[PDB]
Structure 1
């Protein structure tokens, strides 16, 4: 898309020196994802979002936002599964008539009863271009959102390798890169822009709004991290 230069990656140290708290980002990837299996939207706020009557903790619905109306219309009124990262501060979800609730981007795949062996994907992690480990994540979906993968991966690294901590990280910068079978690739900067203080969740999570879907069986995942 193509691969980032070091100097273009967001820095943990810049985020801290702008008085930001990396714990906001930690909590998105440590707390559980929104999940729903075979659900159908109950309503909409704007024509590029779909409101789903799924439970998350004490919330009774989630608004998921798509990048444009046609993408929303691709899923509207259909049986889908939902998997994504919710936020609450800045979430705007008007009631059916009074304002806050649970929101997310993207997250959607068509529900399929022919979709039942878990696949394993090995995430390849490289640090400072010099040490590797891999771990594996699973999903039972043949066609999976990139969001689902990204979350499963960042969640393991946050819990096990200090990807995000309350006030920083074991790293200074990094990105996660996905490679599809046809050989093209894209990446996300793992860290928040230094300007994003206070942390405003929708501006970080809108990367999922394109509801990019991939084939579990063939997708390649690589993380690259730099220490300070």
Structure 2
């Protein structure tokens, strides 16, 4: 886990809006789609379209994980970035993301499994809110997003400017697997590309046993 000194201070971030739009804006979601092309052996290009993009490239953990989902019909769910997102030169409407991929076949729930987010502020966990998905194995990225989307819009986690909280991070807790966490705030001078790499591992989770806690301080 993280120590107060391991956490990035929000008041130290330059252009924090750049995080804000990532979570304030809608995600990139797709259902039964198959890998169309590939730039580097560790990424997968999809001919999926969306507002502001007709192509999507996702960077995965490595080549192995990239060929592992290559010829499979997967579901995509992720927070994208455009600045520093290049492929060829004719594709002028592209968008990049890391991970956020999962097998489509046999990964669906007839009824959404809502997970309980334990938001603790300044040590007092006086808040609880739901978050749901239709996948049995979902990526921490799909869960992580919703968490921040909720908190942004209700607790003002982010704004088109500063943040009411000095520090903050999301902690994930797998049934029996070991835990991990993501710092809601970046380094002073960051880039969405670099920051988003917290989803490059594409670490999925069993939404039927996984737990989620959030630690925010003012």
Same fold, judged at TM 0.5 (above): yes
Give unmatched runs, 5+ long, in structure 2.
none
Question: How many residues are aligned here?
Answer: 217
- Asked if 1:163 corresponds to 2:169, the answer is no
CA distance in 2, matches of 1:64, 1:135: 30
Instruction: State the Cα distance separating 1:113 from its structure 2 match.
Output: 5.2
Instruction: State the Cα distance separating 1:7 from its structure 2 match.
Output: 1.5
The 4+ residue runs of structure 1 with deviation greater than 6 A are none
Cα distance change on mapping 1:114 and 1:78 into 2, 3 Å:
closer
- Correspondence for 2:80 among 75, 86, 111: 86
Cα distance change on mapping 1:29 and 1:169 into 2, 3 Å:
same
Q: Deviations over 1:54-95 (max 9, x none)?
A: 112031110001121001111001000000001111111225
Counterpart position of 1:195: 189
CA distance in 2, matches of 1:190, 1:11: 10
Counterpart position of 2:104: 111
More strand by share: 2
Query: Residue 80 of structure 1 aligns to a residue in which SS?
Result: strand
Query: Residue 154 of structure 2 aligns to a residue in which SS?
Result: helix
Counterpart position of 2:210: 219
CA distance in 2, matches of 1:67, 1:131: 34
Query: Residue 56 of structure 1 aligns to a residue in which SS?
Result: coil
- Asked if 1:205 corresponds to 2:203, the answer is no
> Are the aligned partners of 2:167 and 2:185 in contact in 1 as well (CA < 8 Å)?
yes
Q: Give the TM-score normalised by the residue count of structure 2.
A: 0.95
CA distance in 2, matches of 1:90, 1:143: 30
Query: Residue 117 of structure 1 aligns to a residue in which SS?
Result: strand
Instruction: State the Cα distance separating 1:157 from its structure 2 match.
Output: 0.4
Instruction: State the Cα distance separating 1:132 from its structure 2 match.
Output: 1.9
- Correspondence for 1:32 among 26, 49, 53: 26
Counterpart position of 1:12: 10
Cα distance change on mapping 1:114 and 1:169 into 2, 3 Å:
closer
> Are the aligned partners of 1:42 and 1:51 in contact in 2 as well (CA < 8 Å)?
yes
Give unmatched runs, 5+ long, in structure 1.
none
Q: CA RMSD in A?
A: 1.4
Deviation larger for 145-154 or 131-140: 131-140
